[PDB]
Design an enzyme around this catalytic site. Sequence first.
Site, PDB file in Angstrom:
ATOM      1  CB  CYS A  81      -4.917 -15.019   4.136  1.00 33.17           C
ATOM      2  SG  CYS A  81      -5.641 -16.642   3.523  1.00 33.17           S
ATOM      3  CG  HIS A 136      -1.170 -13.671   2.073  1.00 38.74           C
ATOM      4  ND1 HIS A 136      -1.015 -14.521   3.126  1.00 38.74           N
ATOM      5  CD2 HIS A 136      -1.739 -14.406   1.066  1.00 38.74           C
ATOM      6  CE1 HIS A 136      -1.449 -15.728   2.781  1.00 38.74           C
ATOM      7  NE2 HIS A 136      -1.895 -15.682   1.541  1.00 38.74           N
ATOM      8  CG  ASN A 191      -1.114 -19.045   2.152  1.00 42.74           C
ATOM      9  OD1 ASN A 191      -1.318 -18.353   3.154  1.00 42.74           O
ATOM     10  ND2 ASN A 191      -1.755 -18.847   0.999  1.00 42.74           N
TER      11      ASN A 191
END
Lengths: 334, 334
Positions: B122, B258, B289
């Site tokens: 990520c 994030h 996400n």
Amino acid sequence: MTEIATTSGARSVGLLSVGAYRPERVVTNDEICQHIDSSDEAIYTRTGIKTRRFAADDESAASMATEACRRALSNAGLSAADIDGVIVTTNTHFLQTPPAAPMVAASLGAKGILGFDLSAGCAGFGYALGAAADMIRGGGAATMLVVGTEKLSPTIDMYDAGNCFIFADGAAAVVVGETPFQGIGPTVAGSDGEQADAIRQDIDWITFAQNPSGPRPFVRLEGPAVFRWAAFKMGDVGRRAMDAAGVRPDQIDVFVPHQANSRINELLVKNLQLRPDAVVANDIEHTGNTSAASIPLAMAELLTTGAAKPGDLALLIGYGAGLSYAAQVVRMPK
Amino acid sequence: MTEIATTSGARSVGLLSVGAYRPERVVTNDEICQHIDSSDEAIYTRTGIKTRRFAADDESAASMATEACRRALSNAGLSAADIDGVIVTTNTHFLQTPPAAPMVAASLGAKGILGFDLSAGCAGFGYALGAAADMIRGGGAATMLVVGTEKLSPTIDMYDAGNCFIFADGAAAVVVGETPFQGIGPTVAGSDGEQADAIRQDIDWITFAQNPSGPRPFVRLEGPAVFRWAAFKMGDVGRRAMDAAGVRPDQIDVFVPHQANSRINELLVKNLQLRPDAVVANDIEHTGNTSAASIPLAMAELLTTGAAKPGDLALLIGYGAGLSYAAQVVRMPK
């Protein structure tokens, strides 16, 4: 208002060392012709390959990467602690996530250092090198580990009579750090996406996952298209890498092209206009095509044999998958 | 003997623009709750996610990446011909090879430009950004496209009550070039290999390929471990990034971490000690996400709503898979 500060590092960087890890199992051409209608000499003439190494079932891209990094460290007379980051380049990491960089690092005893995975096909080593060189000079790191690792054997199609004898397993790493003199020339890279299917996995993992009982994915290679491309295009690339390096073709000592095909490379050697006594890597004969690990493994051997010597001026040319290429002139490490 | 030449580029680079592409399909909580024993609220209060986009079957990481690049170009008022290289970051490219980068470049009508795929979980966006910046400054390019694209949907297990409502699809790209003032600060990154299994793929594609009848690969997340890591470690990262960019906490306008968990980020905003009026990205609420695309998509929103304006000083903090993290202070694009 205030400006965003910058960082920087040594503008002079090079290869401090190279370490190579070659799987134990030695697969011969005859052992491959147990499923294909070809011969020992038929393969050796069309590809220049006699044998290649295959990794054990429990070995992976990551495990071999680590193993090659440990040798690159030892050969550099370094400790894992002296590394500030590792770039893992590969196309055989069979997990969408997590990446392998941090894993490697952990096995090396530096679980916390920065790092990432890089894929650009058989030419990923050239990008990782340039990326590491740029990062060092940019002050993002002082010393880094660039490792090319591949485990293609599991992706090979036994029956595919066009490439089952081409791809092999392997891994090799290099240490990049500051040097009293510039050791890594400017990167010359590019690509041709309109030929992305030259070298490919025929079926994506999700389509297969959706039909399991259906056809399983396998690496495909349209040798002709790749041959025509590589053989008659990597010449200009090489001349561009040497040009940006400020070196003359007759000034290079070592030529390490991606070990895809010996007939391709003999075409190149002739096209590049090198010295009649230049040391050319023919590693492919007993290593086969190790994709991203190719160039690194080749460098490691020329050093071992002692054809090449630390400090020689070498031309690295990587070409392959998705039809991408990376090139640069460098000074042979240890 | 002779000199390996060294190149140089603009020393000052920044974000020229940002383009975002979100899949048309809007999946609500209740839909994901049809297949689990959870609730709309329950998810929304644990995660802060109410809705998420899902890409159609005919789409992929590559197709959405191109789409997002076309918008990043138009927003930057450029054409594909102005790009010297593209870095594609993702973990949902379902092909070991060929690399995606050249493919998206071809779709943009620039098949020859350099480029590669980068995976760092990520947090791959932060690495790609730093890597581009480093390349430009290094003279390996003048203008580049860094795109984060993810198609996690196909890897989700609807029956997993621990993460079947967290991951979503998407993509977003930014143009990096020379700018009047420094727009990208030094990169601060790292990882944690010992926690590699935090966000992962249960089964490798080769083990599965050797047993199509067996369990299919899915993405498993250990929310707790990740939460304790992100929430109490990304604070020092943020402080490092601000320290290296020569910026004080109070100076920061925009904090873009994030989009993992709103609760997590909520704790970070306090720990950082930004200004009480410092805006924060809440994009995750209707995007979810989206791994490598997360930060880019978030930036795109704060700009559209106006919460963030061109020239604002932002803190980017990427964390996730294989437990790697990338951070840097940047100036919001136009």
